[PDB]
C-alpha cells in the first residue's frame, strides 16, 4: 500500500487574434518544458469580449496589445512588438521606398475593422493621419488582409511577431519600415486585482517577456 | 493624342476561418499570374454571417465547407480536404495508434464551438459518437485549439490544408489518421442564382479545384 500524499494546475488565458496564432505557439513550447504541470486552456477573442470574460471570471488572465481601456484591471507590459509595412513584390515599383504616406495613392492602405486593436495601434504608432489613403473596404482577419496585399491591392501594417512566424511565406511580399520613428505596440498581461493567482501571473509575465 | 477605347475587375469573396488562412494564399498566387486584372476583396467570417452577407449582396461568392444549409443559393463542390488527428509528441505514448475513441480518456477531444463548421464536419465524417470523450472547454480558433493539443491536453481533428500550410510547424505534434474510413470535408463555392457573374464563378471554381 502507500501513504496518502503556483505554476501547477489549470489556467484560462485569453488572447487577441493578432497575437494568439504567433506568440502562443512559443509560449506553449516554453511552458511544456519549464512548467510541465501547467495546463493552459486558451480563448481567442476581440479585446472587448476578452475583457468582459475576464471581469466575469470566465478567464484568469489575458495577453493583450496595449494601450486599450482596462480600468479596474491590473496589467503588466512585457515587451514591444514592432510594426512593419508590407507590399507585394509586383507592386514594389508603383510604391516608393522609403514610404511617404502623401505619395501613396488614395485608398491604398488596407486596415482591419475597429473591433481589432491592430488598426488603432498601427495608425497611431506609425503616424498615419491622412484618412484619404485608407481603403474603404475593411479587412476582417490579418490573414485575409495580407492576402489582399499579396494580390497587389495596396499596403498595410503587420506586427513583427507575425513575420517571425511565417505569415508572409510563399506570398511574394516585401517588408518595409513604416515612415518616421521606429513604431511598435506594447504587449501586456491583464488580470483581476482580486485574483489569488498573481504569483502565477507574474511568473507567466517573465516567460512571455523572454519571447519578445 | 489617342483614340478613346469576365475575370477582370473586382470580386468580393467570403471564406470561413478554417479555410481562409490556408487556401486563399494559394488562390491569390494563382490568380496573380493567370487573371492579373482580377482584384479579390476578401472577408473572413462564420458560415452563417457569410451567408447573410451573400444574400444581402455584400459579397459576390463564398468558399465554404459543405454541407451546410444553403437553401436558395447555387453551389459547386470543387474538392475534398481530408481530416487528420493530431497529438503532442510527448503524449504519443498515453494515446495508442491506431486511435480508437473508446480507449481515449473521457474529455480528451477538444473541439471548436458550434459557430464553426469544422466541428460538425469532423465529428460526423470521423464518426465520433461518444460525447463523453469531448472536453467541455470549447476552443474559439483553430490556432488556439492546436496550441492546447501542443500543450499536451488531448487531441483534435485538423484539416489537411492547415497541415500543408505549416500550422503544426515547431509545435512538436504527431499527425494520425482518424478511426475508420478516410474522412474529409467537401469544399465548395456558393453564390446567388440571380448573379450576373456566374461565368466568373465557374472559372474561379476551376482554379480552386486545382488547388485541392
mmCIF file of C-alpha atoms in Angstrom:
data_model
loop_
_atom_site.group_PDB
_atom_site.id
_atom_site.type_symbol
_atom_site.label_atom_id
_atom_site.label_comp_id
_atom_site.label_asym_id
_atom_site.label_seq_id
_atom_site.Cartn_x
_atom_site.Cartn_y
_atom_site.Cartn_z
ATOM 1 C CA UNK A 1 0.000 0.000 0.000
ATOM 2 C CA UNK A 2 1.036 3.637 0.097
ATOM 3 C CA UNK A 3 0.725 6.753 2.155
ATOM 4 C CA UNK A 4 -1.823 9.445 1.326
ATOM 5 C CA UNK A 5 0.085 12.471 -0.021
ATOM 6 C CA UNK A 6 1.919 28.113 -8.197
ATOM 7 C CA UNK A 7 2.713 27.138 -11.838
ATOM 8 C CA UNK A 8 0.732 23.941 -11.411
ATOM 9 C CA UNK A 9 -2.801 23.215 -12.413
ATOM 10 C CA UNK A 10 -5.040 24.918 -14.932
ATOM 11 C CA UNK A 11 -5.084 28.489 -16.239
ATOM 12 C CA UNK A 12 -7.682 30.016 -18.609
ATOM 13 C CA UNK A 13 -5.888 32.526 -20.815
ATOM 14 C CA UNK A 14 -7.438 34.833 -23.414
ATOM 15 C CA UNK A 15 -5.570 36.416 -26.284
ATOM 16 C CA UNK A 16 -6.386 38.649 -29.286
ATOM 17 C CA UNK A 17 -6.400 37.401 -32.889
ATOM 18 C CA UNK A 18 -3.250 39.337 -34.000
ATOM 19 C CA UNK A 19 -1.190 37.826 -31.148
ATOM 20 C CA UNK A 20 -2.648 34.360 -30.487
ATOM 21 C CA UNK A 21 -1.505 32.475 -33.649
ATOM 22 C CA UNK A 22 2.089 33.683 -33.203
ATOM 23 C CA UNK A 23 3.204 34.215 -29.600
ATOM 24 C CA UNK A 24 1.184 31.395 -28.017
ATOM 25 C CA UNK A 25 2.958 28.727 -30.052
ATOM 26 C CA UNK A 26 6.235 29.846 -28.459
ATOM 27 C CA UNK A 27 4.634 30.168 -25.019
ATOM 28 C CA UNK A 28 3.303 26.600 -25.083
ATOM 29 C CA UNK A 29 6.683 25.143 -26.055
ATOM 30 C CA UNK A 30 8.362 27.082 -23.252
ATOM 31 C CA UNK A 31 5.844 26.126 -20.548
ATOM 32 C CA UNK A 32 5.828 22.474 -21.664
ATOM 33 C CA UNK A 33 9.450 22.279 -20.528
ATOM 34 C CA UNK A 34 9.683 24.855 -17.746
ATOM 35 C CA UNK A 35 6.273 24.364 -16.085
ATOM 36 C CA UNK A 36 5.160 20.926 -17.228
ATOM 37 C CA UNK A 37 2.202 20.731 -14.795
ATOM 38 C CA UNK A 38 0.603 23.928 -16.108
ATOM 39 C CA UNK A 39 -2.379 23.261 -18.381
ATOM 40 C CA UNK A 40 -3.262 26.296 -20.496
ATOM 41 C CA UNK A 41 -6.899 26.474 -21.680
ATOM 42 C CA UNK A 42 -6.996 29.110 -24.401
ATOM 43 C CA UNK A 43 -9.611 31.559 -25.710
ATOM 44 C CA UNK A 44 -9.153 33.768 -28.769
ATOM 45 C CA UNK A 45 -11.475 36.767 -28.987
ATOM 46 C CA UNK A 46 -11.672 40.553 -29.527
ATOM 47 C CA UNK A 47 -10.289 42.889 -26.823
ATOM 48 C CA UNK A 48 -13.703 43.978 -25.585
ATOM 49 C CA UNK A 49 -15.036 40.408 -25.438
ATOM 50 C CA UNK A 50 -11.937 39.209 -23.599
ATOM 51 C CA UNK A 51 -12.237 41.993 -21.025
ATOM 52 C CA UNK A 52 -15.889 41.059 -20.343
ATOM 53 C CA UNK A 53 -14.892 37.417 -19.871
ATOM 54 C CA UNK A 54 -12.075 38.472 -17.546
ATOM 55 C CA UNK A 55 -14.399 40.697 -15.478
ATOM 56 C CA UNK A 56 -16.890 37.831 -15.278
ATOM 57 C CA UNK A 57 -14.253 35.369 -14.038
ATOM 58 C CA UNK A 58 -14.530 33.193 -17.159
ATOM 59 C CA UNK A 59 -10.827 33.735 -17.904
ATOM 60 C CA UNK A 60 -7.923 34.135 -15.446
ATOM 61 C CA UNK A 61 -5.559 36.323 -17.488
ATOM 62 C CA UNK A 62 -5.298 37.966 -20.905
ATOM 63 C CA UNK A 63 -2.455 38.715 -23.273
ATOM 64 C CA UNK A 64 -3.427 41.952 -24.995
ATOM 65 C CA UNK A 65 -1.926 44.667 -27.116
ATOM 66 C CA UNK A 66 -1.761 47.852 -25.032
ATOM 67 C CA UNK A 67 -2.886 50.538 -24.554
ATOM 68 C CA UNK A 68 -6.564 49.723 -24.527
ATOM 69 C CA UNK A 69 -9.135 50.781 -21.932
ATOM 70 C CA UNK A 70 -8.673 48.416 -18.941
ATOM 71 C CA UNK A 71 -9.922 50.481 -15.995
ATOM 72 C CA UNK A 72 -10.042 48.478 -12.795
ATOM 73 C CA UNK A 73 -7.778 45.647 -14.007
ATOM 74 C CA UNK A 74 -4.160 45.064 -13.166
ATOM 75 C CA UNK A 75 -1.671 44.971 -16.042
ATOM 76 C CA UNK A 76 1.974 44.413 -16.754
ATOM 77 C CA UNK A 77 3.678 45.329 -20.045
ATOM 78 C CA UNK A 78 6.094 42.561 -21.016
ATOM 79 C CA UNK A 79 7.532 43.683 -24.323
ATOM 80 C CA UNK A 80 7.242 45.599 -27.564
ATOM 81 C CA UNK A 81 6.270 44.187 -30.982
ATOM 82 C CA UNK A 82 7.496 46.347 -33.886
ATOM 83 C CA UNK A 83 5.321 47.269 -36.870
ATOM 84 C CA UNK A 84 6.376 46.877 -40.470
ATOM 85 C CA UNK A 85 4.625 47.638 -43.716
ATOM 86 C CA UNK A 86 4.249 45.091 -46.489
ATOM 87 C CA UNK A 87 3.696 45.351 -50.242
ATOM 88 C CA UNK A 88 3.693 42.794 -52.998
ATOM 89 C CA UNK A 89 6.949 42.281 -54.889
ATOM 90 C CA UNK A 90 4.966 43.052 -58.089
ATOM 91 C CA UNK A 91 3.933 46.440 -56.667
ATOM 92 C CA UNK A 92 7.349 47.382 -55.265
ATOM 93 C CA UNK A 93 7.840 49.758 -58.226
ATOM 94 C CA UNK A 94 4.493 51.605 -58.067
ATOM 95 C CA UNK A 95 5.236 52.283 -54.365
ATOM 96 C CA UNK A 96 8.438 54.161 -53.488
ATOM 97 C CA UNK A 97 10.642 53.257 -50.516
ATOM 98 C CA UNK A 98 11.084 54.912 -48.033
ATOM 99 C CA UNK A 99 7.312 55.087 -47.788
ATOM 100 C CA UNK A 100 5.855 58.569 -47.545
ATOM 101 C CA UNK A 101 2.094 58.419 -46.999
ATOM 102 C CA UNK A 102 1.424 61.554 -49.089
ATOM 103 C CA UNK A 103 2.943 59.852 -52.145
ATOM 104 C CA UNK A 104 0.785 56.710 -51.898
ATOM 105 C CA UNK A 105 -2.398 56.552 -53.975
ATOM 106 C CA UNK A 106 -5.645 57.398 -52.229
ATOM 107 C CA UNK A 107 -7.345 54.291 -50.731
ATOM 108 C CA UNK A 108 -4.159 52.196 -50.938
ATOM 109 C CA UNK A 109 -3.818 51.391 -47.215
ATOM 110 C CA UNK A 110 -5.981 48.455 -46.101
ATOM 111 C CA UNK A 111 -6.822 48.099 -42.396
ATOM 112 C CA UNK A 112 -8.766 45.747 -40.174
ATOM 113 C CA UNK A 113 -12.172 46.895 -38.917
ATOM 114 C CA UNK A 114 -12.319 48.693 -35.464
ATOM 115 C CA UNK A 115 -13.016 45.691 -33.192
ATOM 116 C CA UNK A 116 -9.311 44.986 -33.929
ATOM 117 C CA UNK A 117 -6.753 46.747 -31.800
ATOM 118 C CA UNK A 118 -4.144 46.366 -34.590
ATOM 119 C CA UNK A 119 -5.732 49.241 -36.508
ATOM 120 C CA UNK A 120 -5.776 51.823 -33.699
ATOM 121 C CA UNK A 121 -2.266 50.891 -32.652
ATOM 122 C CA UNK A 122 -0.687 50.867 -36.091
ATOM 123 C CA UNK A 123 -2.363 54.069 -37.284
ATOM 124 C CA UNK A 124 -1.261 55.967 -34.180
ATOM 125 C CA UNK A 125 2.233 54.486 -33.771
ATOM 126 C CA UNK A 126 3.026 54.809 -37.489
ATOM 127 C CA UNK A 127 1.538 58.306 -37.693
ATOM 128 C CA UNK A 128 -0.988 57.771 -40.498
ATOM 129 C CA UNK A 129 -3.064 60.938 -40.298
ATOM 130 C CA UNK A 130 -4.317 61.224 -43.910
ATOM 131 C CA UNK A 131 -7.625 59.331 -43.929
ATOM 132 C CA UNK A 132 -7.859 59.594 -47.720
ATOM 133 C CA UNK A 133 -5.121 56.988 -48.025
ATOM 134 C CA UNK A 134 -7.234 54.358 -46.273
ATOM 135 C CA UNK A 135 -9.210 51.988 -48.467
ATOM 136 C CA UNK A 136 -12.921 51.942 -47.528
ATOM 137 C CA UNK A 137 -13.118 48.120 -47.663
ATOM 138 C CA UNK A 138 -12.148 46.947 -44.187
ATOM 139 C CA UNK A 139 -10.451 43.619 -43.603
ATOM 140 C CA UNK A 140 -11.762 41.132 -41.073
ATOM 141 C CA UNK A 141 -8.666 38.996 -40.340
ATOM 142 C CA UNK A 142 -4.938 39.535 -40.508
ATOM 143 C CA UNK A 143 -4.504 36.578 -42.935
ATOM 144 C CA UNK A 144 -7.037 37.938 -45.398
ATOM 145 C CA UNK A 145 -5.604 41.442 -45.067
ATOM 146 C CA UNK A 146 -2.166 40.147 -46.039
ATOM 147 C CA UNK A 147 -3.684 38.129 -48.901
ATOM 148 C CA UNK A 148 -5.246 41.302 -50.354
ATOM 149 C CA UNK A 149 -1.829 42.981 -50.186
ATOM 150 C CA UNK A 150 -0.349 39.866 -51.838
ATOM 151 C CA UNK A 151 -2.929 40.264 -54.622
ATOM 152 C CA UNK A 152 -1.393 43.715 -55.269
ATOM 153 C CA UNK A 153 -4.222 45.866 -53.913
ATOM 154 C CA UNK A 154 -2.116 48.128 -51.714
ATOM 155 C CA UNK A 155 -0.209 48.076 -48.439
ATOM 156 C CA UNK A 156 -0.808 47.554 -44.739
ATOM 157 C CA UNK A 157 0.850 47.378 -41.304
ATOM 158 C CA UNK A 158 1.905 43.982 -39.895
ATOM 159 C CA UNK A 159 3.312 43.108 -36.451
ATOM 160 C CA UNK A 160 6.793 41.666 -36.294
ATOM 161 C CA UNK A 161 5.647 38.568 -34.463
ATOM 162 C CA UNK A 162 3.533 37.591 -37.481
ATOM 163 C CA UNK A 163 6.520 37.958 -39.807
ATOM 164 C CA UNK A 164 8.698 35.935 -37.433
ATOM 165 C CA UNK A 165 6.049 33.147 -37.528
ATOM 166 C CA UNK A 166 5.959 32.856 -41.295
ATOM 167 C CA UNK A 167 2.739 34.727 -42.142
ATOM 168 C CA UNK A 168 4.340 36.080 -45.328
ATOM 169 C CA UNK A 169 5.796 32.767 -46.539
ATOM 170 C CA UNK A 170 5.162 31.988 -50.198
ATOM 171 C CA UNK A 171 3.140 35.197 -50.776
ATOM 172 C CA UNK A 172 5.924 37.111 -52.593
ATOM 173 C CA UNK A 173 5.791 40.176 -50.266
ATOM 174 C CA UNK A 174 8.393 42.814 -49.392
ATOM 175 C CA UNK A 175 8.824 44.064 -45.818
ATOM 176 C CA UNK A 176 9.370 47.815 -45.411
ATOM 177 C CA UNK A 177 9.806 50.166 -42.457
ATOM 178 C CA UNK A 178 6.871 52.492 -41.700
ATOM 179 C CA UNK A 179 7.640 56.213 -42.064
ATOM 180 C CA UNK A 180 9.226 58.160 -39.265
ATOM 181 C CA UNK A 181 10.337 56.774 -35.934
ATOM 182 C CA UNK A 182 10.529 53.112 -35.056
ATOM 183 C CA UNK A 183 6.946 52.191 -34.235
ATOM 184 C CA UNK A 184 5.620 49.291 -32.209
ATOM 185 C CA UNK A 185 2.827 48.058 -29.936
ATOM 186 C CA UNK A 186 3.211 47.133 -26.267
ATOM 187 C CA UNK A 187 2.205 43.609 -25.293
ATOM 188 C CA UNK A 188 0.931 43.009 -21.802
ATOM 189 C CA UNK A 189 -0.758 40.662 -19.373
ATOM 190 C CA UNK A 190 -4.031 41.755 -17.733
ATOM 191 C CA UNK A 191 -5.848 40.205 -14.747
ATOM 192 C CA UNK A 192 -8.262 40.978 -11.889
ATOM 193 C CA UNK A 193 -6.839 42.749 -8.810
ATOM 194 C CA UNK A 194 -8.857 40.376 -6.623
ATOM 195 C CA UNK A 195 -7.270 37.278 -8.145
ATOM 196 C CA UNK A 196 -5.451 34.905 -5.823
ATOM 197 C CA UNK A 197 -3.116 33.863 -8.670
ATOM 198 C CA UNK A 198 -0.893 36.932 -9.037
ATOM 199 C CA UNK A 199 2.255 34.928 -8.253
ATOM 200 C CA UNK A 200 1.369 32.720 -11.241
ATOM 201 C CA UNK A 201 0.675 35.763 -13.444
ATOM 202 C CA UNK A 202 3.983 37.412 -12.612
ATOM 203 C CA UNK A 203 5.916 34.188 -13.429
ATOM 204 C CA UNK A 204 3.993 33.932 -16.678
ATOM 205 C CA UNK A 205 4.802 37.582 -17.455
ATOM 206 C CA UNK A 206 8.536 36.804 -17.072
ATOM 207 C CA UNK A 207 8.224 33.895 -19.514
ATOM 208 C CA UNK A 208 6.361 35.971 -22.096
ATOM 209 C CA UNK A 209 8.829 38.844 -21.755
ATOM 210 C CA UNK A 210 11.587 36.425 -22.832
ATOM 211 C CA UNK A 211 9.683 35.592 -26.055
ATOM 212 C CA UNK A 212 9.505 39.205 -27.228
ATOM 213 C CA UNK B 1 -3.369 62.323 -78.878
ATOM 214 C CA UNK B 2 -5.093 58.959 -78.729
ATOM 215 C CA UNK B 3 -8.334 57.253 -79.522
ATOM 216 C CA UNK B 4 -10.957 56.614 -76.850
ATOM 217 C CA UNK B 5 -11.017 52.854 -76.162
ATOM 218 C CA UNK B 6 -15.127 38.116 -67.174
ATOM 219 C CA UNK B 7 -12.062 37.559 -64.909
ATOM 220 C CA UNK B 8 -11.427 41.290 -64.856
ATOM 221 C CA UNK B 9 -12.390 43.801 -62.252
ATOM 222 C CA UNK B 10 -13.292 43.345 -58.613
ATOM 223 C CA UNK B 11 -14.798 40.389 -56.754
ATOM 224 C CA UNK B 12 -15.874 40.321 -53.075
ATOM 225 C CA UNK B 13 -15.202 36.832 -51.748
ATOM 226 C CA UNK B 14 -16.049 35.476 -48.295
ATOM 227 C CA UNK B 15 -14.395 32.495 -46.680
ATOM 228 C CA UNK B 16 -14.564 30.653 -43.327
ATOM 229 C CA UNK B 17 -11.802 30.810 -40.703
ATOM 230 C CA UNK B 18 -10.627 27.157 -41.133
ATOM 231 C CA UNK B 19 -10.128 27.652 -44.897
ATOM 232 C CA UNK B 20 -9.165 31.315 -45.382
ATOM 233 C CA UNK B 21 -5.608 31.335 -43.895
ATOM 234 C CA UNK B 22 -4.602 28.300 -45.980
ATOM 235 C CA UNK B 23 -6.308 28.003 -49.372
ATOM 236 C CA UNK B 24 -6.568 31.728 -50.143
ATOM 237 C CA UNK B 25 -2.802 32.197 -50.081
ATOM 238 C CA UNK B 26 -2.553 29.678 -52.932
ATOM 239 C CA UNK B 27 -5.552 31.181 -54.732
ATOM 240 C CA UNK B 28 -4.053 34.683 -54.728
ATOM 241 C CA UNK B 29 -0.731 33.480 -56.144
ATOM 242 C CA UNK B 30 -2.549 31.596 -58.898
ATOM 243 C CA UNK B 31 -4.861 34.469 -59.881
ATOM 244 C CA UNK B 32 -1.993 36.989 -59.781
ATOM 245 C CA UNK B 33 -0.486 35.148 -62.745
ATOM 246 C CA UNK B 34 -3.491 33.673 -64.539
ATOM 247 C CA UNK B 35 -6.010 36.517 -64.087
ATOM 248 C CA UNK B 36 -3.870 39.548 -63.310
ATOM 249 C CA UNK B 37 -6.746 42.059 -63.664
ATOM 250 C CA UNK B 38 -8.885 40.345 -61.019
ATOM 251 C CA UNK B 39 -8.872 42.191 -57.688
ATOM 252 C CA UNK B 40 -10.066 39.981 -54.833
ATOM 253 C CA UNK B 41 -11.545 41.833 -51.826
ATOM 254 C CA UNK B 42 -11.718 39.305 -49.009
ATOM 255 C CA UNK B 43 -13.962 38.784 -45.967
ATOM 256 C CA UNK B 44 -13.374 36.161 -43.282
ATOM 257 C CA UNK B 45 -16.400 35.284 -41.157
ATOM 258 C CA UNK B 46 -18.550 32.430 -39.781
ATOM 259 C CA UNK B 47 -20.724 30.408 -42.204
ATOM 260 C CA UNK B 48 -23.985 31.969 -41.062
ATOM 261 C CA UNK B 49 -22.603 35.519 -41.228
ATOM 262 C CA UNK B 50 -21.157 34.913 -44.686
ATOM 263 C CA UNK B 51 -24.472 33.566 -45.972
ATOM 264 C CA UNK B 52 -26.308 36.678 -44.698
ATOM 265 C CA UNK B 53 -23.763 38.914 -46.432
ATOM 266 C CA UNK B 54 -24.137 36.889 -49.628
ATOM 267 C CA UNK B 55 -27.953 37.101 -49.507
ATOM 268 C CA UNK B 56 -27.680 40.848 -48.917
ATOM 269 C CA UNK B 57 -25.378 41.349 -51.918
ATOM 270 C CA UNK B 58 -22.456 42.475 -49.739
ATOM 271 C CA UNK B 59 -20.315 39.613 -51.077
ATOM 272 C CA UNK B 60 -20.309 38.058 -54.572
ATOM 273 C CA UNK B 61 -19.211 34.496 -53.763
ATOM 274 C CA UNK B 62 -18.185 32.342 -50.805
ATOM 275 C CA UNK B 63 -15.752 29.498 -50.317
ATOM 276 C CA UNK B 64 -17.338 27.277 -47.683
ATOM 277 C CA UNK B 65 -17.003 23.833 -46.217
ATOM 278 C CA UNK B 66 -20.037 21.787 -47.279
ATOM 279 C CA UNK B 67 -22.588 20.560 -46.447
ATOM 280 C CA UNK B 68 -24.147 23.454 -44.607
ATOM 281 C CA UNK B 69 -27.673 24.817 -45.029
ATOM 282 C CA UNK B 70 -27.614 26.974 -48.206
ATOM 283 C CA UNK B 71 -31.220 26.837 -49.422
ATOM 284 C CA UNK B 72 -31.825 29.127 -52.363
ATOM 285 C CA UNK B 73 -28.141 29.598 -53.271
ATOM 286 C CA UNK B 74 -26.233 27.987 -56.082
ATOM 287 C CA UNK B 75 -23.194 25.885 -55.175
ATOM 288 C CA UNK B 76 -20.423 23.897 -56.750
ATOM 289 C CA UNK B 77 -18.215 21.427 -54.854
ATOM 290 C CA UNK B 78 -14.619 21.809 -56.024
ATOM 291 C CA UNK B 79 -12.678 19.345 -53.922
ATOM 292 C CA UNK B 80 -12.225 17.365 -50.739
ATOM 293 C CA UNK B 81 -9.997 18.278 -47.768
ATOM 294 C CA UNK B 82 -9.038 15.250 -45.643
ATOM 295 C CA UNK B 83 -9.164 15.243 -41.839
ATOM 296 C CA UNK B 84 -6.337 14.093 -39.622
ATOM 297 C CA UNK B 85 -5.981 13.885 -35.879
ATOM 298 C CA UNK B 86 -3.078 15.430 -34.007
ATOM 299 C CA UNK B 87 -1.464 14.749 -30.632
ATOM 300 C CA UNK B 88 1.644 16.074 -28.982
ATOM 301 C CA UNK B 89 4.823 14.031 -29.385
ATOM 302 C CA UNK B 90 5.018 13.970 -25.547
ATOM 303 C CA UNK B 91 1.560 12.365 -25.369
ATOM 304 C CA UNK B 92 2.102 9.852 -28.181
ATOM 305 C CA UNK B 93 2.550 7.103 -25.555
ATOM 306 C CA UNK B 94 -0.544 7.813 -23.419
ATOM 307 C CA UNK B 95 -2.603 7.657 -26.652
ATOM 308 C CA UNK B 96 -2.467 4.454 -28.718
ATOM 309 C CA UNK B 97 -2.330 4.429 -32.524
ATOM 310 C CA UNK B 98 -4.484 3.454 -34.397
ATOM 311 C CA UNK B 99 -6.830 5.707 -32.462
ATOM 312 C CA UNK B 100 -9.928 4.033 -31.082
ATOM 313 C CA UNK B 101 -12.232 6.591 -29.466
ATOM 314 C CA UNK B 102 -13.384 4.180 -26.727
ATOM 315 C CA UNK B 103 -9.790 3.852 -25.494
ATOM 316 C CA UNK B 104 -9.187 7.611 -25.186
ATOM 317 C CA UNK B 105 -9.709 9.240 -21.789
ATOM 318 C CA UNK B 106 -13.009 10.993 -21.201
ATOM 319 C CA UNK B 107 -12.867 14.718 -22.144
ATOM 320 C CA UNK B 108 -9.683 14.284 -24.208
ATOM 321 C CA UNK B 109 -11.061 15.501 -27.561
ATOM 322 C CA UNK B 110 -11.069 19.299 -27.901
ATOM 323 C CA UNK B 111 -13.374 20.903 -30.485
ATOM 324 C CA UNK B 112 -14.235 24.370 -31.708
ATOM 325 C CA UNK B 113 -17.539 25.885 -30.574
ATOM 326 C CA UNK B 114 -20.649 25.380 -32.866
ATOM 327 C CA UNK B 115 -20.441 28.576 -34.963
ATOM 328 C CA UNK B 116 -17.533 26.656 -36.582
ATOM 329 C CA UNK B 117 -18.379 24.215 -39.323
ATOM 330 C CA UNK B 118 -15.142 22.276 -38.616
ATOM 331 C CA UNK B 119 -16.739 20.665 -35.563
ATOM 332 C CA UNK B 120 -19.918 19.363 -37.222
ATOM 333 C CA UNK B 121 -17.968 18.127 -40.215
ATOM 334 C CA UNK B 122 -15.166 16.412 -38.338
ATOM 335 C CA UNK B 123 -17.416 14.768 -35.746
ATOM 336 C CA UNK B 124 -19.698 13.338 -38.429
ATOM 337 C CA UNK B 125 -17.063 12.387 -41.022
ATOM 338 C CA UNK B 126 -14.759 10.834 -38.408
ATOM 339 C CA UNK B 127 -17.635 9.070 -36.649
ATOM 340 C CA UNK B 128 -17.156 10.417 -33.115
ATOM 341 C CA UNK B 129 -20.380 9.354 -31.425
ATOM 342 C CA UNK B 130 -19.251 9.117 -27.770
ATOM 343 C CA UNK B 131 -19.912 12.586 -26.336
ATOM 344 C CA UNK B 132 -18.102 11.698 -23.107
ATOM 345 C CA UNK B 133 -14.797 11.905 -24.955
ATOM 346 C CA UNK B 134 -15.320 15.581 -25.768
ATOM 347 C CA UNK B 135 -13.739 18.108 -23.434
ATOM 348 C CA UNK B 136 -16.298 20.643 -22.138
ATOM 349 C CA UNK B 137 -13.971 23.619 -22.762
ATOM 350 C CA UNK B 138 -14.633 24.670 -26.347
ATOM 351 C CA UNK B 139 -11.956 26.262 -28.490
ATOM 352 C CA UNK B 140 -12.552 29.506 -30.340
ATOM 353 C CA UNK B 141 -9.915 29.366 -33.117
ATOM 354 C CA UNK B 142 -8.078 26.618 -34.932
ATOM 355 C CA UNK B 143 -4.663 28.047 -33.877
ATOM 356 C CA UNK B 144 -5.547 28.043 -30.196
ATOM 357 C CA UNK B 145 -7.099 24.587 -30.485
ATOM 358 C CA UNK B 146 -3.844 23.225 -31.897
ATOM 359 C CA UNK B 147 -1.855 25.055 -29.204
ATOM 360 C CA UNK B 148 -3.880 23.306 -26.472
ATOM 361 C CA UNK B 149 -3.107 19.964 -28.133
ATOM 362 C CA UNK B 150 0.559 21.036 -28.316
ATOM 363 C CA UNK B 151 0.420 21.717 -24.563
ATOM 364 C CA UNK B 152 -0.499 18.021 -24.136
ATOM 365 C CA UNK B 153 -4.155 18.445 -23.180
ATOM 366 C CA UNK B 154 -5.601 15.921 -25.615
ATOM 367 C CA UNK B 155 -6.324 15.502 -29.311
ATOM 368 C CA UNK B 156 -8.387 17.082 -32.062
ATOM 369 C CA UNK B 157 -9.261 16.947 -35.777
ATOM 370 C CA UNK B 158 -7.356 19.167 -38.240
ATOM 371 C CA UNK B 159 -7.943 19.716 -41.977
ATOM 372 C CA UNK B 160 -5.201 18.687 -44.352
ATOM 373 C CA UNK B 161 -4.940 22.137 -45.868
ATOM 374 C CA UNK B 162 -3.839 23.516 -42.488
ATOM 375 C CA UNK B 163 -1.112 20.881 -42.199
ATOM 376 C CA UNK B 164 0.035 21.584 -45.758
ATOM 377 C CA UNK B 165 0.335 25.305 -44.825
ATOM 378 C CA UNK B 166 2.555 24.750 -41.817
ATOM 379 C CA UNK B 167 0.075 25.141 -38.939
ATOM 380 C CA UNK B 168 1.898 22.429 -36.973
ATOM 381 C CA UNK B 169 5.428 23.762 -37.540
ATOM 382 C CA UNK B 170 7.587 23.937 -34.424
ATOM 383 C CA UNK B 171 4.799 22.637 -32.132
ATOM 384 C CA UNK B 172 6.174 19.072 -31.797
ATOM 385 C CA UNK B 173 2.914 17.353 -32.914
ATOM 386 C CA UNK B 174 2.248 13.947 -34.478
ATOM 387 C CA UNK B 175 -0.267 13.524 -37.309
ATOM 388 C CA UNK B 176 -2.508 10.446 -37.114
ATOM 389 C CA UNK B 177 -5.357 9.053 -39.207
ATOM 390 C CA UNK B 178 -8.849 9.279 -37.673
ATOM 391 C CA UNK B 179 -10.518 5.915 -36.989
ATOM 392 C CA UNK B 180 -12.392 4.082 -39.685
ATOM 393 C CA UNK B 181 -12.765 5.175 -43.280
ATOM 394 C CA UNK B 182 -10.881 8.014 -44.897
ATOM 395 C CA UNK B 183 -12.762 11.103 -43.771
ATOM 396 C CA UNK B 184 -12.833 14.558 -45.298
ATOM 397 C CA UNK B 185 -14.888 17.715 -45.845
ATOM 398 C CA UNK B 186 -16.138 18.984 -49.204
ATOM 399 C CA UNK B 187 -15.060 22.479 -50.204
ATOM 400 C CA UNK B 188 -17.336 24.489 -52.430
ATOM 401 C CA UNK B 189 -18.174 27.840 -53.959
ATOM 402 C CA UNK B 190 -21.582 29.398 -53.218
ATOM 403 C CA UNK B 191 -23.292 32.349 -54.946
ATOM 404 C CA UNK B 192 -26.700 33.887 -55.731
ATOM 405 C CA UNK B 193 -28.711 32.349 -58.600
ATOM 406 C CA UNK B 194 -29.581 35.869 -59.757
ATOM 407 C CA UNK B 195 -25.938 36.890 -60.099
ATOM 408 C CA UNK B 196 -24.747 38.068 -63.494
ATOM 409 C CA UNK B 197 -21.223 36.784 -62.735
ATOM 410 C CA UNK B 198 -21.678 33.014 -62.997
ATOM 411 C CA UNK B 199 -19.121 32.753 -65.815
ATOM 412 C CA UNK B 200 -16.592 34.309 -63.413
ATOM 413 C CA UNK B 201 -17.638 31.956 -60.590
ATOM 414 C CA UNK B 202 -17.276 28.850 -62.729
ATOM 415 C CA UNK B 203 -13.753 29.908 -63.856
ATOM 416 C CA UNK B 204 -12.864 30.575 -60.240
ATOM 417 C CA UNK B 205 -14.238 27.149 -59.261
ATOM 418 C CA UNK B 206 -11.890 25.513 -61.811
ATOM 419 C CA UNK B 207 -8.910 27.363 -60.320
ATOM 420 C CA UNK B 208 -9.799 26.379 -56.758
ATOM 421 C CA UNK B 209 -10.389 22.760 -57.767
ATOM 422 C CA UNK B 210 -6.760 22.645 -58.966
ATOM 423 C CA UNK B 211 -5.518 23.740 -55.507
ATOM 424 C CA UNK B 212 -7.200 20.865 -53.672
#
